[PDB]
Each structure stands twice: as structure tokens, then as C-alpha cells.
Symmetry: D2
Amino acid sequence: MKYMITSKGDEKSDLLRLNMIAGFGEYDMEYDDVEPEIVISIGGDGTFLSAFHQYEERLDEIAFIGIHTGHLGFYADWRPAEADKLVKLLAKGEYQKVSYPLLKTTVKYGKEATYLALNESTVKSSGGPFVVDVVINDIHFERFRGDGLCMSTPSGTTAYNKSLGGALMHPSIEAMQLTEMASINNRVYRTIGSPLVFPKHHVVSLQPVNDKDFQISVDHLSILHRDVQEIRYEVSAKKIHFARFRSFPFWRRVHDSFIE
Amino acid sequence: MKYMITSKGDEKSDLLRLNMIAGFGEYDMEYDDVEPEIVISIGGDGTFLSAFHQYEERLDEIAFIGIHTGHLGFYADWRPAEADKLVKLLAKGEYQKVSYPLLKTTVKYGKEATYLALNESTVKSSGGPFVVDVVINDIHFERFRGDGLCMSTPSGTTAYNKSLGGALMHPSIEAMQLTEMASINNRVYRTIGSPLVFPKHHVVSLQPVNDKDFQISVDHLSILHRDVQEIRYEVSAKKIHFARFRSFPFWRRVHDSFIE
Amino acid sequence: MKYMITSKGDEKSDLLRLNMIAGFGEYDMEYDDVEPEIVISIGGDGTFLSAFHQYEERLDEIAFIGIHTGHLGFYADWRPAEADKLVKLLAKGEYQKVSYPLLKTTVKYGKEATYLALNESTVKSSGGPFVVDVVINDIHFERFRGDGLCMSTPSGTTAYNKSLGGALMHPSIEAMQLTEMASINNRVYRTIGSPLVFPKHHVVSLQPVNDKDFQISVDHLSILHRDVQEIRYEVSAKKIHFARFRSFPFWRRVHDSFIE
Amino acid sequence: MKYMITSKGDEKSDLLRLNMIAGFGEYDMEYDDVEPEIVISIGGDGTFLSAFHQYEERLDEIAFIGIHTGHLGFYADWRPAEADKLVKLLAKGEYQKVSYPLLKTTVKYGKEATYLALNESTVKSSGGPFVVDVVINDIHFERFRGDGLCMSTPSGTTAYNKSLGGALMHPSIEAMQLTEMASINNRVYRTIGSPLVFPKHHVVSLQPVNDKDFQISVDHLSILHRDVQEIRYEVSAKKIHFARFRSFPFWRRVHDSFIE
Ligand SMILES: CN(CC#Cc1nc2c(N)ncnc2n1Cc1ccccc1)C[C@H]1O[C@@H](n2cnc3c(N)ncnc32)[C@H](O)[C@@H]1O
Ligand SMILES: CN(CC#Cc1nc2c(N)ncnc2n1Cc1ccccc1)C[C@H]1O[C@@H](n2cnc3c(N)ncnc32)[C@H](O)[C@@H]1O
Ligand SMILES: CN(CC#Cc1nc2c(N)ncnc2n1Cc1ccccc1)C[C@H]1O[C@@H](n2cnc3c(N)ncnc32)[C@H](O)[C@@H]1O
Ligand SMILES: CN(CC#Cc1nc2c(N)ncnc2n1Cc1ccccc1)C[C@H]1O[C@@H](n2cnc3c(N)ncnc32)[C@H](O)[C@@H]1O
């Protein structure tokens, strides 16, 4: 079948990419980075995120695989020594597929633009103070004033969400988690403080109070959005598909990264 | 149909209970606290928890209702002034049912005992230091040493789970959340720190390291368990059923309790 | 004696400033914003911070006073109705002086520049990831990677330091507190997590690892510093002097702002 | 001079204690556990705490030393291999003294009892809910409701205080820090949340609201106090004296215990 391989760009990843292509050359596998069915990432989770956004238009027909040349990543969970055995099983068919939820971000101005996040999406202020009204299902919830907010996917809870005090959430749960960035709480300003976990079809809407310019990030991508009228968060109907060949539980993957 | 009413025990709740019984006396409704189909709680969330555990053997045929004489509770979300209108709709049939997940706790000795929690279940030490090995799906995760642990239901996240830094989780998500109580983290002792959210069929197992006596709590109930071999946590197959007559969203109920 | 008054710039503060000047016109008081001995701030704590930095060169001969037209500030702790009684006591001499510690920030390039902070000083990254080596008294302590750091004065602990989880510290303690901004902690990156309180003569030094550009803030002021070789933090030998006329304890001032 | 040595009680500590006594036998040193001037602790920080409370009546004439047979302690900061060199310098006189602050706890009933803490003192509830009014310098500050409170010494900030989110505070600062244990914060109950650092002569007073029984701890010691009218916290006028022979900074001691 059709496949493609992306690389971190260093000596270790580039020369491992060529060995897998040569190994695939001994099989009925066609290299194609236009319409691939298998996308292989070699490097780190940052390299994997680039491979995801590079093909975020054909998610429902691509099975992603990650090989970490450095340390164990949550998406790149295949050691380089296991790459030769990876080429064989990936060629003989016969492998399962696992899917993770994604976050959909919509930004309205005064043309509406939408984005797709595998880790999280954050909103910060462009210079001045960050003040937004938080609306959950057309109901005003709180007037947040702090450094920013962060809406995370399940698999993204181990990333930026974790540093903000958020909970680690198993990827089989179709949900999204919102966390606070150094919120202000006194007599006049009051926020919830706690992280919030929203199920599918729950729409969280951020709306400006004074300044209408925001620095919005989607995974590694981050651009200053001007004259923002609304930012909408919701669990996307799209899902990212992984190719599994063995048992590597999520909590087992959490233990190796943070415990030992 | 058959119904029963429990009361906090003060002047305000007892005399409101008699007015509802008299109002039910004008309908085809039979008072019965043996096999009731409608359980009405008047007082606070503490009174509601007693009504839940009083009939936790007939959950699948009881619709719970809560009336708060004090402040707004998350389970007692009906003002006393709305009690007269509550008697009418509850008698003419025609009402929906909403269900919340529950937590199943199993304790093994050396006879196994099981419990059911609507809020959360906590484990603390009987005097000495608290040290337990945490096992997730037969896989060792961490050796916890601190004050204790807390496994919370979705609707219980707004209670003890919130005070421990846990995330607020919508009740439509069939899950359970584990939080830490003043954990120790240095060079030799390392825990995850973050709250963990487990889906259905995930079994979290606590196992003793030295002391085998623990102070285990299930909602308000708490008893010292002796010679404990294992404590097992999992999302229960049972669900608590509420009777709804209007729209009172969970996040709307969170806003009124913590924001204003 | 010589005095000057600064204003927030709105109707309430400007017209209260003129009434105090007219009240001072009935006394042996000379208005002078070149070499004043009494600096009066009318507005909020933000207006007070501007009055402090406007005369941070003559701290040891100025007694600051704050009048809050809005809500109670920690530096502007005089209600506008008490302004007439403030003019009288301020003219008849006979008032005490209280002093608060300050933070000294030094930035080295490759000309060294120094700053003075009444609240706190923060370091963030200019776009890329924030990675700095933390050095305490010429000893390497940790390699921090996160969103940034914040070194706070005692009176500044109730501001940005509080939102980052820092401790509230009484101003009579000559110290400085450092807090973390969404730090990363896994197997390879490890920080202390806890806030650190340093006494006088303790020098905390931040040093770059890769990117040498940082966004450094001192109270409201914040500018991008290019080609930074070192940032040094230490409790300044200078102190800000307040004029007191009554008893308004710090914890009493904390209670009114955050409790009720 | 007069000296005594206490031991953890295992093979490693008991047989190291006898070697130091034999080494002291070659000098003008008299073993005496009645009126010693040098107290040597061999084991861990727990063994050191017992040595402190064993002689807390003669603090101003005792220089404490700690030898850790296990891992590096904050009070036992001498490796067992350095014990032979410790006997020589300790005999030839010529060593400096460093002093750490202590916490004074007073409990009133209806006879007043006082205690001395090197690490911290905690208050918890005897079964029922924990509710106390917090009073700072005869001024009501907050009505706390949670699991308990913890007042820590400077050197105790690295212990229980750290697990509760408290700040790490250098021992040269004569202060005390109060932290919260899973406090409740909603519409009706509001606490400060942040840790509080009090200087000398500041008196923090806890007073019961309903239940007058409390489980009070002082370092390892903890006893149930009945019919409590007041608990008073303040920085003690007494100080614990250490004998130093080299440079081992506090932050350097923090780095080795928590970073590497
Ligand atoms: C760097 N880009 C690729 C990735 C990834 C990733 N994702 C992960 C995941 N899900 N689990 C475990 N490691 C994951 N990595 C590896 C990793 C990256 C940074 C720090 C530590 C690990 C984008 C990621 O920059 C992050 N980030 C920014 N500020 C952060 C902070 N203050 N704290 C944690 N993250 C932070 C957000 O995560 C963003 O998406
Ligand atoms: C008191 N008994 C009935 C109830 C309830 C409830 N449940 C609620 C819920 N889900 N949301 C909102 N209010 C809820 N209340 C009302 C409420 C109770 C205590 C404090 C604040 C509110 C049992 C509850 O004693 C709690 N608890 C103990 N130590 C706590 C702490 N340190 N922090 C928050 N709780 C704590 C656990 O919650 C336990 O179950
Ligand atoms: C706004 N400028 C004047 C001031 C002040 C001040 N100082 C105070 C103090 N010491 N105590 C109590 N209120 C104080 N105010 C009033 C106040 C200001 C902002 C938010 C709440 C209150 C500069 C202040 O912008 C802050 N800031 C930025 N991001 C913050 C956050 N995420 N959280 C709290 N602060 C934050 C830092 O504090 C900076 O110095
Ligand atoms: C065990 N007894 C001797 C000691 C000490 C000490 N003091 C230390 C210090 N200052 N710095 C570094 N290590 C210190 N140890 C070693 C250490 C002890 C326990 C856990 C980790 C280390 C009494 C100590 O039982 C503690 N404790 C209880 N519950 C705790 C928690 N949930 N979290 C941290 N502590 C907790 C309080 O500290 C109490 O005083």
C-alpha cells in the first residue's frame, strides 16, 4: 500500500528513514506523500505533530505510526531497534486501528476560520491584560482574567494541560479539558479555579470584553488573530487513527514518561 | 404510585414534608418506604446521600428528587417554594429520567465486601504512615506515600475531589477520578501528582506495603478496615436515576454554587 | 513642606485631586513635582505604581500615600471620604513612617542595566521555548523549562505571585519569593515546583541555555531584552517609605481584599 | 567536653555509634546523656527529631549533629564515611554554631500546655468536620473548613509544608508558615487558599466553632486534645543550635534531596 515517512532532520532520523524505505523496497509498498495510507514519523512528538497537521485533511484514511529516536514519546512509542520488525508487520497487513479524539477550534471575526488540534489550543492576550467571558452552551459561566486558557484533548492532557494542574485523561474518553493560566481571584474577580472536562456536543465559547486581539495557538502553530468576535471549542467529529501492533497501554505509557 | 419522603430533621424540613404528603393525599399516590418508586429528600446534599444509601438496593426502580431548605445543593436543586408545583407534575406522570454514574469499591481481607459511592471513596491510614502500591489494570503504576487517595464519581467531582485539586467532570461521562492527598515527592519517592480520570472497565487496585489497616470512607460512611489485602475501584454498572421536570444544566448548577 | 499629587485621569480622581490642592492651599504646603517630600496617589494600585517609578530616584526622602477611588488597594488604602482629614494631619507634621522592601533586578548583555520593582519582576521567552539555568549563590540549582519565572517582593506577594500559587508574605520580612509558570516535570526535566523565599544578600541568577532573548517585566513596565547574558535578582538595599496615620494591618488589608 | 549519641536502632547505626564512642575514648571527651553539650544523631531525620525533643529543655547549651546512614537528610547531613573526621574536629574545639528558628504551640482548655516544634504543628478533627475561626493578632481573618491546618518552621518547609503546596523558606528567616489541607471554597465558605508567612511576634490563634476536640501533632508526636478553647502559634524565642564544620548551603541541601 501507499506510505510516506517524515524525519526530524538529524543524522539519526534521516538515516533510519532510508533504511525503512529500503526495507519497504523489498515489499509491495509504494512511497507516496500525496495520498499515503500509512504515515511514519521518526524523531519526537514534535515531529509527529507536524506529520499530523501535514495530512489533517485525510485523517479517516491514514494510520499514523511514531518512532522516537530520542526518549519515549506518547505518540512516538516505538524504539528504533524495533523498526525492522515494524516494516514486516506493516507490509503483511493484519494490524488493528485505534482512534483518539480531537479538538475543533472556531474563530469568528467581522471570514470564520476553523482549526484542528491533537494536543491543545490556548488563548493568550496580545500585550494587554487577558479578559474574556466564558460561555458554556449559550450560558454565561465566568468572567476570566489572568494569563490565558487552555483547551486540551485527551491525549494532550499529558502535555501543556498537565503543567497547568489539569488531570490526566484516558484517550478512550471523547472529551476536552479546559485549564486556567494564573487566574486572578479576589473580591471582585472570581473564577472556578478547577479544570473542567466537557463531553461531546458541549460548546465552550470565549468572548472578548475590551481588547479584541488574541494570540491563539493550535499545537505548535500560534498566530495573532485580529478583531476576534468569538472563539468556539468543541470535541471534533474527526478522529486520528493509529496503527497498533502490540500492547502499550496509555497508563503504562504515562508511567514510563513521568515515574521511570 | 408509591413514594416516600425523608427529612433533615429540623422545623423547616419536617413541616414541609407534611405539606407534600397532604398534597399527595389529594392524588392517587401511596406512601410507602418499603418499596417506593419516588424518593424525595428535603434538607441538603447530606440528607440526599442518606436517602441514596437507604435505598441503594433498588436503584433501577427509584427516581430521586432533592429539595434544599438551605442553600442550593447539586443533588437537592429544587427550592422549597417550588414544592407545590412539584407535587402536581410528579402525580400526573409525564417526566423524564436522567442517570448518573456510580463508583464501586471492593475490599478484600483474609470475606470480600463491596460498597457503592455517589460522591467519592477515600483511603487513609490508621495512625501510621500511608503507603500503598497503585495498580492500574494489573500493572504497577506508582508507590504512593502521603495522607491518602480519593476516587470520585462525576457528580462527586464538585465535592471532596474539588478541594484536592481535581477537575470538575460532567456527569454524562461514565468515568471516575483519582486524586492525591499531600503526596511526598523527592529523590526516592515519586508520584504522578496529577489527577487521573479512568473510563469504564478500568480497575484501579490499591495494595498495602507494610501496614494493612486502613480508614476507608464511602460518602459520609467511614469505618476502619482491618487486615486489608486489596482495595479495588471501578465504575459501577449501577446508575442512580433522577426525576427531571425542567432544565437545570450541570455547569449552570456549578456556576450558582461557586461563582454566584 | 513640598508635595505633589498624581491622578488616575478620570472625573472622580481629577476633581478629588483639585480639592486636596485647595485644602493644602490653606496651609504652609508648597506644590512641587520636582523635589517633593510627599507623593499622593489617587486612583488604584496601578496609579500608585506609576507614582513610585516616577520618583524611584528619591525614595529615601519621600513618604507615599495612596487614595483608592475604586476598590481597596494594598497601596491605596485610604477612602476618598477620608481625604479631608488626610490633608489636616499631613500638614501638622506628626506622622510615622513605615518601609517596605524592594527587588533589585540586574540584566547583563555583551551595558549592564538595573531596575527596581515594588511588586515583582518576571522573565518570559520571546516566542520560542523558555529554558534557563537557575543559579543560587553561584551554585547551579535547576534547569527550568516552562512559561517563565516570577520574583516577587513581600508586598507583591498579593499580586501576580498569588496567582502562581505563591505564599502571602508579611512586608516586615526583608525577602523575595520566586514562583514557577507552568513548569515541565517528567523523567528528563525536573524542577522544584515549590515557591522559594530568599533572604537578603542571596543572589538568584538566571542564565540562558539556547535562546538569549527574553521578555522581562518590572511591575507594569515590560520590554524585550536582546542578547541577555544573565539576570540577577536580590533584595534591594533601597526601601519605599509610606506615611501612616492610623492602624491598618497587612493581614487586615489582605482579609478585606480576598475574604470580604 | 560532655557528649551523647543516639541511634536509629539497626545494625548500621548501632555499630557506627560504638566506633565513634571508641574514637572519642582517645580524647578528653566524657559520655553523658544527662547534661550533654554535643548530641550526635545517627540514622535519619526521624532519629534527629527524637534527639531534639529528648533534650528540648537544654537547647541553648547543646550543639546538634546529624549523621544519615540512609539517604541525605536536612538535619542529618553528614555521610557515615566522614564520621572519623567528625570525631577529630569535634574534639579539638574550633567549630562554628548555626541556629534555626522554632515554633511555639500553646493549647488552652477549661491547664494550658505548650509545645516546641522543629518541623511543624498540625491540627485535624477528631472524627467530625474540621471548622475553626482563624485569628491573626486578635483580628478575625477567616472561618476555615477543610481537613486541617499546618504551621511550619523554616527548616520544616521542606517536609509536610512542601506536600501541602507551601513555599520553601530559608532557615535564616525567623518566621512561620501556615498552609491549608483540602479547604472548602464555594459561595458560603471562603478561605485565603494561599500559604501565609508570619514574622516574629505575630500570634495566629485557632478557635473552635462547634466541636472542641482536635488531633494536634508536634513533629512525630500527635495526641488527641479534649475540650480545647484555643490554639496559639508564634515564632518561639528558643532556637536549636547546630555544629558546622564545613559549607553545606540550605539550597544546596534542597537540590540534592529533590533535584538529584
Ligand atoms: C513542542 N510541540 C510538540 C510537542 C509535544 C508533546 N506532546 C506531549 C504529550 N501530549 N505528552 C507528553 N509529551 C508531549 N510532548 C513533548 C513535550 C513538549 C514540551 C514539553 C514537554 C514534552 C508543541 C507543544 O508545545 C507545548 N508546551 C508549551 N508550553 C508547555 C508547558 N509549559 N508544559 C508542557 N508543554 C508545553 C504544548 O504541549 C504544545 O502542543
Ligand atoms: C457531608 N456529607 C454529605 C455531602 C455532600 C456534598 N456533596 C457535594 C457535591 N458533590 N457538590 C457540592 N456540594 C456537595 N456537598 C455538600 C458539601 C459538603 C461538605 C463541604 C462542602 C459541601 C459527605 C461529604 O463529606 C465530604 N468532604 C469531606 N471533606 C471534604 C473537603 N475537605 N472538601 C469537600 N468535601 C469534603 C465529602 O464530599 C463527603 O461525600
Ligand atoms: C496592573 N499593574 C498595576 C498593579 C497592581 C496590583 N498590585 C497588587 C497587589 N500587590 N496586591 C493586590 N492587588 C494588586 N494590584 C491590583 C491588581 C492588578 C491586577 C490584577 C489584580 C489586582 C501591574 C501588575 O500587573 C500584574 N499581573 C499580571 N498578571 C497577573 C495575574 N495573572 N495575576 C495577578 N496579577 C497580575 C502584576 O501584579 C503587575 O505588577
Ligand atoms: C516522620 N517524622 C520524622 C521526619 C522528618 C523529616 N523532616 C524533613 C524535612 N524537614 N525535610 C526533608 N525531609 C524531612 N523528613 C524526612 C521525611 C519524612 C516523611 C516524608 C518525607 C521525608 C515526622 C514527620 O512526619 C511528616 N509528614 C507527615 N505527612 C507528611 C506528608 N504528607 N508529606 C511530608 N511529610 C509528612 C512531618 O514532616 C513530620 O514532622
